[PDB]
Structure 1
Amino acid sequence: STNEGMNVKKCCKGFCIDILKKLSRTVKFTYDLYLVTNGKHGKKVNNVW
């Protein structure tokens, strides 16, 4: 019923995590990693992604 929540810190490993870490080794950018809370990958629901 409400839209208030918390930002839980969670660990991330895997293939794309290694891709991101090696790109940070090469391109030298600091990642700002978080998860999606809107939902799934993406779909244009009535001209709204």
Structure 2
Amino acid sequence: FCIDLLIKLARTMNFTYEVHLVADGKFGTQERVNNSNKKEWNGMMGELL
């Protein structure tokens, strides 16, 4: 569904794309981890930011 919609979005908006699966395998949540004492996003949300 989403790849067909992405091909449509690319064609109308005239951009090229490179698709890659998220390494984490997660959709994305804010996790403190506490290693850096600060919250960070994982999943696809982290990759975008």
Q: 2:14 & 2:6 partners in 1: Cα distance?
A: 11
User: Which one has the bigger strand percentage?
Assistant: 2
**Percent of matched pairs sharing the same residue:** 51
Secondary structure at 2:3 match in 1: helix
List alignment gaps of at least 5 residues for structure 1.
Answer: 1-14
Q: Which has the higher contact order (CA 8 A, sep 6+)?
A: 2
TM-score, L = length of structure 1:
0.64
RMSD of aligned alpha carbons: 0.9
Residue identity matched to 1:38: D
TM-score, L = length of structure 2:
0.64
List alignment gaps of at least 5 residues for structure 2.
Answer: 33-38, 42-49
Aligned length: 35
User: Which one has the bigger helix percentage?
Assistant: 2
Moved over 2 A (4+): none
